Tab-separated table of C-alpha atoms in Angstrom:
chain	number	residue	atom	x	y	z
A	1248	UNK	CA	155.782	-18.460	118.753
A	1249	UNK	CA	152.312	-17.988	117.721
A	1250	UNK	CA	150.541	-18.364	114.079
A	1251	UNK	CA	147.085	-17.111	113.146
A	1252	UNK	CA	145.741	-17.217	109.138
A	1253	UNK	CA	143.393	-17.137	107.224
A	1254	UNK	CA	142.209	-18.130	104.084
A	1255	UNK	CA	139.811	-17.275	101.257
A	1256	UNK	CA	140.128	-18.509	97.684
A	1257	UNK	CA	140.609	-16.156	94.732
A	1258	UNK	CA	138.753	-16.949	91.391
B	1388	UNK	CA	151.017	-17.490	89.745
B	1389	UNK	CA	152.279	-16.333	93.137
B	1390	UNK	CA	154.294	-13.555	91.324
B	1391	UNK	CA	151.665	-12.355	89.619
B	1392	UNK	CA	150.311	-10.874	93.132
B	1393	UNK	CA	151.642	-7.853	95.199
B	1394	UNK	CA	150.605	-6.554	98.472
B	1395	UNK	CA	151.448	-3.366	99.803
B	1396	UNK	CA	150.282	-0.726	102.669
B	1397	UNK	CA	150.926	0.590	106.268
B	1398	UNK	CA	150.179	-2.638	107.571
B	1399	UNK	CA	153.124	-4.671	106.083
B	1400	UNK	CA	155.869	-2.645	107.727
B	1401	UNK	CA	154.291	-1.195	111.516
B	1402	UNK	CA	151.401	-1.554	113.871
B	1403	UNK	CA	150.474	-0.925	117.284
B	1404	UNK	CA	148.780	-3.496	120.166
B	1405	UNK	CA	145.325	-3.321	119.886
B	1406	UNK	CA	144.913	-0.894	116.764
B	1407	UNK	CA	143.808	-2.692	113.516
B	1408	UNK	CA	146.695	-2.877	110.973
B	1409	UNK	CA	146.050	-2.339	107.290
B	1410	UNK	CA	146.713	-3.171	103.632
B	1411	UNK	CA	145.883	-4.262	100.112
B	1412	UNK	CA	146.191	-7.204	98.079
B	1413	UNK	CA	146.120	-6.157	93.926
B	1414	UNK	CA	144.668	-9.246	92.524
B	1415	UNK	CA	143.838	-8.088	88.854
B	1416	UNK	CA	146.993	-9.745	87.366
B	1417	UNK	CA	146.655	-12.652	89.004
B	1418	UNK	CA	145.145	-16.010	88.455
B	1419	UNK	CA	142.730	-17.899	90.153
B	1420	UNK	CA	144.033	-19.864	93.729
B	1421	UNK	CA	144.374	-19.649	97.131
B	1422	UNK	CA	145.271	-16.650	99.481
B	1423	UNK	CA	146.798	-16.904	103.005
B	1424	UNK	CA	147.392	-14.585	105.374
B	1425	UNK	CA	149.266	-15.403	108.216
B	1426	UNK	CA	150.471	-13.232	111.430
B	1427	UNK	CA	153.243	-15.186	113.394
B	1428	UNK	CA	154.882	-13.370	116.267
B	1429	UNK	CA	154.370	-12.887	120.074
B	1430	UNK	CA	150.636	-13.358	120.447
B	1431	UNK	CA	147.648	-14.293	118.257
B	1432	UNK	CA	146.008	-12.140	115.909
B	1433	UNK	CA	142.621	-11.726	114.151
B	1434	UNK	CA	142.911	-11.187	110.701
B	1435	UNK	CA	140.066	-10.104	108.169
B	1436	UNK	CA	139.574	-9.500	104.411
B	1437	UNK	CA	137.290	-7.037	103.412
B	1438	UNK	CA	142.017	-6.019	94.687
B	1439	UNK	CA	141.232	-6.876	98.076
B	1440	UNK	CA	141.989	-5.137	101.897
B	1441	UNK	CA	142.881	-7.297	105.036
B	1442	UNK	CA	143.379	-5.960	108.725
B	1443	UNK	CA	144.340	-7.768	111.053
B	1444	UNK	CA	145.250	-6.490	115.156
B	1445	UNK	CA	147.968	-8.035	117.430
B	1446	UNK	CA	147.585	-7.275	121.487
B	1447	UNK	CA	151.095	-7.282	122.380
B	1448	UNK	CA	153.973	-5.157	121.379
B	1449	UNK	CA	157.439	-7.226	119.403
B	1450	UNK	CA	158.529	-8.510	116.062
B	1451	UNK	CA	156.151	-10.308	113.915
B	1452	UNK	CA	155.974	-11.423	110.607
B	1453	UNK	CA	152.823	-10.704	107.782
B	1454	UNK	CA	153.076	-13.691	104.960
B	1455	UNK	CA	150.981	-13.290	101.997
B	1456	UNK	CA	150.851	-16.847	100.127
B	1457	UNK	CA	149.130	-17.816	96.733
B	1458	UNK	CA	148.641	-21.745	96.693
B	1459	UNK	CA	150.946	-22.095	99.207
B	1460	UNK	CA	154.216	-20.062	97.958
B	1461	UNK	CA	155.360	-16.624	98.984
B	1462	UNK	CA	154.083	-13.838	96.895
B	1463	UNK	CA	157.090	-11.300	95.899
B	1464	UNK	CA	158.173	-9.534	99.407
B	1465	UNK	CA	156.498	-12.403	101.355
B	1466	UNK	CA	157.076	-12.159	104.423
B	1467	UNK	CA	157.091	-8.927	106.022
B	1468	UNK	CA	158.386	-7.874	109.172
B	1469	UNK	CA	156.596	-5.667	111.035
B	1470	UNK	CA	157.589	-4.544	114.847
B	1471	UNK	CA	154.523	-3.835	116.590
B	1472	UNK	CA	154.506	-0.899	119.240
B	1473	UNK	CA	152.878	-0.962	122.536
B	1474	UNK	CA	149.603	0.414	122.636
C	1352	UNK	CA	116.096	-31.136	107.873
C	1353	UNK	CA	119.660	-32.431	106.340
C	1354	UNK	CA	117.977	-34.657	104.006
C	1355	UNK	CA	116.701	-31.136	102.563
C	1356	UNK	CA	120.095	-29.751	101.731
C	1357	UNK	CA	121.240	-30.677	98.643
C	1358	UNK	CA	124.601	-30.115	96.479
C	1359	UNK	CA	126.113	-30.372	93.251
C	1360	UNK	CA	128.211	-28.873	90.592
C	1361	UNK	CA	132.084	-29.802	89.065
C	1362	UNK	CA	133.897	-29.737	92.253
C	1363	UNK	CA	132.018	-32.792	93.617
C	1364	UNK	CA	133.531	-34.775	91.318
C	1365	UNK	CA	137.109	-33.756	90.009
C	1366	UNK	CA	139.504	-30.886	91.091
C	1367	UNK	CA	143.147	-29.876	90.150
C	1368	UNK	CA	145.708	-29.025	92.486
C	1369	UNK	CA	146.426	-25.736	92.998
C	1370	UNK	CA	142.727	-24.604	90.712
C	1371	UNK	CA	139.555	-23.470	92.911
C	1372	UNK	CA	136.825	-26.043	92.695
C	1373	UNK	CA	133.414	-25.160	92.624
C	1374	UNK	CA	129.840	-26.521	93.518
C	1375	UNK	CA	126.755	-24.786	94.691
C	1376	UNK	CA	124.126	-25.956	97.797
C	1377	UNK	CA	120.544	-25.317	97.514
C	1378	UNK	CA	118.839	-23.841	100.798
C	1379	UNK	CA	115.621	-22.963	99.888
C	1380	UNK	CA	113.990	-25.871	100.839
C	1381	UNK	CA	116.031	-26.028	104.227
C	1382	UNK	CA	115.669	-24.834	107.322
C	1383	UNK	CA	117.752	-22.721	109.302
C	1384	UNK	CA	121.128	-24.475	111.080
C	1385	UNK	CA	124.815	-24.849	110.869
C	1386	UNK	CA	126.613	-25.768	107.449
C	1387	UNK	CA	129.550	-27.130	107.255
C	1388	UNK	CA	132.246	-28.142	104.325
C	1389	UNK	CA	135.043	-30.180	105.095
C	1390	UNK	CA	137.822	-31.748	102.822
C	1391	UNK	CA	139.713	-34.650	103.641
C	1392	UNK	CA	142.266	-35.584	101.853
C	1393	UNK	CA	146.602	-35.729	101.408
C	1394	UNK	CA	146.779	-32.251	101.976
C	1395	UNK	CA	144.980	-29.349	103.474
C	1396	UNK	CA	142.144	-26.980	102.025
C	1397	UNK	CA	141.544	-23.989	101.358
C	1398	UNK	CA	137.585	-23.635	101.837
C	1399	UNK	CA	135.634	-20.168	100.832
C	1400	UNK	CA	131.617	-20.159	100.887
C	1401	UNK	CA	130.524	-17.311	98.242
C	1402	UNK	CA	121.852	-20.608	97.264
C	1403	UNK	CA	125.449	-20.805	98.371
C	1404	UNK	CA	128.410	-21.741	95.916
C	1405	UNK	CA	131.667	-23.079	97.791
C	1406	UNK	CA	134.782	-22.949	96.181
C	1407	UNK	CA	137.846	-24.727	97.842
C	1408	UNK	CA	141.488	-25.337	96.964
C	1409	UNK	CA	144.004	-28.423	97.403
C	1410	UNK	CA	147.753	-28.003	96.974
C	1411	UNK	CA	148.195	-31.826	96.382
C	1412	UNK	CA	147.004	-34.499	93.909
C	1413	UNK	CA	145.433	-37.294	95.430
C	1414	UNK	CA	141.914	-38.569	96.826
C	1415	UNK	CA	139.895	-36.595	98.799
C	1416	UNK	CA	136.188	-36.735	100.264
C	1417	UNK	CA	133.917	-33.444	100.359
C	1418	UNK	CA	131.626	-33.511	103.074
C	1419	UNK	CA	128.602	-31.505	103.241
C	1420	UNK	CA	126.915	-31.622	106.803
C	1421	UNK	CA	123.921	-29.834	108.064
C	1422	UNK	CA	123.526	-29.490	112.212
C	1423	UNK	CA	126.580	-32.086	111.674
C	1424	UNK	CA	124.536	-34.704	109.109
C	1425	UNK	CA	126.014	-35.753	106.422
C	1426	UNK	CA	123.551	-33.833	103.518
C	1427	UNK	CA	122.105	-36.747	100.826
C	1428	UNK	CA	125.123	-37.951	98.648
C	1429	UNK	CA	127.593	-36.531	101.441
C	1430	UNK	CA	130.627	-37.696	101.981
C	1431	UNK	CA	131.693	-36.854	97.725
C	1432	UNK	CA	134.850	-38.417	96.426
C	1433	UNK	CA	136.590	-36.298	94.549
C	1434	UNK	CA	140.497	-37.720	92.648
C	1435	UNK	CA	142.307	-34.449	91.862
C	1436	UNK	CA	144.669	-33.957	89.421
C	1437	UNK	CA	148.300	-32.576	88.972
C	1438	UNK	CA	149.164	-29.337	88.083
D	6	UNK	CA	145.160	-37.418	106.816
D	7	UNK	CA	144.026	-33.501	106.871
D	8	UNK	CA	141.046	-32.179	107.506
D	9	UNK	CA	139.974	-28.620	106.369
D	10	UNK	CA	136.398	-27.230	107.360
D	11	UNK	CA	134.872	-23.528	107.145
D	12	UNK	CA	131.473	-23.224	108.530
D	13	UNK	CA	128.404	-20.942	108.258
D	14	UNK	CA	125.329	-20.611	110.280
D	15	UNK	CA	122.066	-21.000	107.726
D	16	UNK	CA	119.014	-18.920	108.935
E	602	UNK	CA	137.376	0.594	124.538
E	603	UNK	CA	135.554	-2.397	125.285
E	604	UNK	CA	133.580	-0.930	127.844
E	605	UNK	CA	132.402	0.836	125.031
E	606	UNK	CA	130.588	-2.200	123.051
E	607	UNK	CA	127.678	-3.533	123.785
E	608	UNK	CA	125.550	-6.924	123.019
E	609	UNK	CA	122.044	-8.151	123.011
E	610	UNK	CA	119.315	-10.554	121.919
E	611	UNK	CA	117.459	-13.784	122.936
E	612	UNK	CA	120.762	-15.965	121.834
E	613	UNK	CA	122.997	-14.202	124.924
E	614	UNK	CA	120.214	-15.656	127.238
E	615	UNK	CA	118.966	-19.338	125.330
E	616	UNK	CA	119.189	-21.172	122.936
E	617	UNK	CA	117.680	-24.430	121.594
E	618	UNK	CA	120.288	-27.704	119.855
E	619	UNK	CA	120.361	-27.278	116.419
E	620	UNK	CA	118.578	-24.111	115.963
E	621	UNK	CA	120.247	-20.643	115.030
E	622	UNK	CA	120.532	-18.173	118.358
E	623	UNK	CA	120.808	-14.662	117.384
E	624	UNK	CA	122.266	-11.882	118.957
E	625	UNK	CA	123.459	-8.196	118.015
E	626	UNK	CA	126.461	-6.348	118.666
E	627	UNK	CA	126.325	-2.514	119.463
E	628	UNK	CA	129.345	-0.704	117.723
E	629	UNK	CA	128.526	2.679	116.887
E	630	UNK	CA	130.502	4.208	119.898
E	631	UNK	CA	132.971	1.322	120.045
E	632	UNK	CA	137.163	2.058	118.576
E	633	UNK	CA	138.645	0.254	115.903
E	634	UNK	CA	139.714	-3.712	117.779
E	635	UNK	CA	139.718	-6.805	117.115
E	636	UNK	CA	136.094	-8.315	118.313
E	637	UNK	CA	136.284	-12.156	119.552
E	638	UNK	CA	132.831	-14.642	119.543
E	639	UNK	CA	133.488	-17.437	121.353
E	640	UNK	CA	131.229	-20.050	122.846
E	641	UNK	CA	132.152	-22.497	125.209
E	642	UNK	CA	130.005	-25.945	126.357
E	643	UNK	CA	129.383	-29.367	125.776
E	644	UNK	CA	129.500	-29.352	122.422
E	645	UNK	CA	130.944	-27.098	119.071
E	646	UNK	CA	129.559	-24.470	117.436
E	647	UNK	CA	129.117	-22.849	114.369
E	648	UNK	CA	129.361	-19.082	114.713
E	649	UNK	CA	128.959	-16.733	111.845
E	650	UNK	CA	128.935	-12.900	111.619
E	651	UNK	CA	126.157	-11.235	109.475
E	652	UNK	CA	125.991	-2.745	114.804
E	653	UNK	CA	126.398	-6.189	113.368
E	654	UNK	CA	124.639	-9.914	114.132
E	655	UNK	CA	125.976	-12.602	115.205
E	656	UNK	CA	124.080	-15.992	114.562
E	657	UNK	CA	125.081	-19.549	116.128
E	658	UNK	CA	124.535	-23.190	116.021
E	659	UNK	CA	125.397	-26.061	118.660
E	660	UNK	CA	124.372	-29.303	119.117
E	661	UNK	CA	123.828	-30.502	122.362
E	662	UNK	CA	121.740	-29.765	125.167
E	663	UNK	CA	123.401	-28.202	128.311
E	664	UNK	CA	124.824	-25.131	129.971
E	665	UNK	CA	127.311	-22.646	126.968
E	666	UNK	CA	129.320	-19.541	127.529
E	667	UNK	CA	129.173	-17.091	124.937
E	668	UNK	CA	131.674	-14.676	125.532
E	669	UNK	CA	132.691	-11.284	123.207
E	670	UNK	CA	135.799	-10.016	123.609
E	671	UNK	CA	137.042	-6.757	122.356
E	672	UNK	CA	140.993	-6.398	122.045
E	673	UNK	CA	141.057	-9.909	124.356
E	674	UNK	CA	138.963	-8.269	127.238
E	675	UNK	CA	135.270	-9.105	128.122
E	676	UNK	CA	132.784	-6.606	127.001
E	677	UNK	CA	130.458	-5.565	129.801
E	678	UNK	CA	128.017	-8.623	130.815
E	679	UNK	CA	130.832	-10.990	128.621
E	680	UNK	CA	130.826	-14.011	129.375
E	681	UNK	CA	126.373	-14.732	128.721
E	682	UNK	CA	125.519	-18.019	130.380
E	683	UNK	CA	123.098	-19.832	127.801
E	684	UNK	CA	121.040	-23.155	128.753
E	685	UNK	CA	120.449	-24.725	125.652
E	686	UNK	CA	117.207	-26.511	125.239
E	687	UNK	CA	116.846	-30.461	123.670
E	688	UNK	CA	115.872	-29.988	120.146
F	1394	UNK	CA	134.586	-28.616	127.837
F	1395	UNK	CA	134.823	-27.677	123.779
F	1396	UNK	CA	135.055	-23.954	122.656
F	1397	UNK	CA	134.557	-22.606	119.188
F	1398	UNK	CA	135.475	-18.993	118.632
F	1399	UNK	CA	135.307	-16.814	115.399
F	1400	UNK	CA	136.884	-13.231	114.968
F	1401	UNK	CA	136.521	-10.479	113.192
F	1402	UNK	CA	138.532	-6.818	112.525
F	1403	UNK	CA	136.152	-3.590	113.727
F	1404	UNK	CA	137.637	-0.908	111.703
């Protein structure tokens, strides 16, 4: 059961 | 504000094993926060950004699932299942 | 050359749960190495770089510390405590 | 107690 | 298809504590893939993307693997044995 | 024996 993310951040 | 942002594209319902996988995120209605993207299935993906695009490519074939979270809660469809073919 | 980094701007000082906060790092007077942000705190970060402005977002209230580290120093000022507010 | 980092390399 | 990228530069062959080692990464006759930096050794790294470049940081002396991986396989050459120098 | 790895998508 694998989990990969990732991320930014919206303005 | 998670409702305020949809996703859509190829990407969110099939794929194939090595081949990157692709769709948009429409961002123009929404406020400011934090995106995820997370692949969970049987193997690891890598997962870019580049409105906005991601891809992302699995290397085996099966079920996985695409979420799409705005400060942590599902945006409308979130997740998506996607079965991956073999390459 | 960490003492040559240098940071500042509203996010360095208060946030809100759930709102990107923002602060910029000055580089021109550095030289070249490896930056990194960290934020420590009751819940986990999101973290974008974007001169260099940073924007990052918490999910929780609470106290958390903002490190800025250059070739993993602690930049002057470095570890900033920032209390962030409810939604 | 979490701990978030991203990273860049500064030329 | 990743026989088909290549890499190069003084950073797949030495690099120095604390100072950026830069390499490039051939992908004009390359597929589409997911393309994998790691570096393995004594101590972390920042690695950052920037044909592309890749630049990156560690912080200890001693013997590092860089390795790039195309869809999870070695490109040829992958894994680069890299002393690193005392800074 | 640490390892640090960073990944991109090659369209």
């Amino acid at each position: 059961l694998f989990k990969s993310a990732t991320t930014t951040v919206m303005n | 504000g998670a409702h305020k942002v949809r996703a859509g594209g190829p990407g969110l319902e099939r794929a194939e094993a090595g081949v990157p996988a692709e769709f948009s995120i429409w961002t123009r209605e929404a406020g400011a926060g934090g995106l995820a993207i997370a692949v969970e299935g049987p193997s690891k993906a890598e997962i870019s950004f580049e409105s906005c695009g991601v891809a992302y490519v699995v290397q085996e074939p099966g079920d996985y699932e695409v979420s799409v979270k705005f400060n942590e809660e599902h945006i409308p469809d979130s997740p998506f299942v996607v079965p991956v073919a073999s390459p």
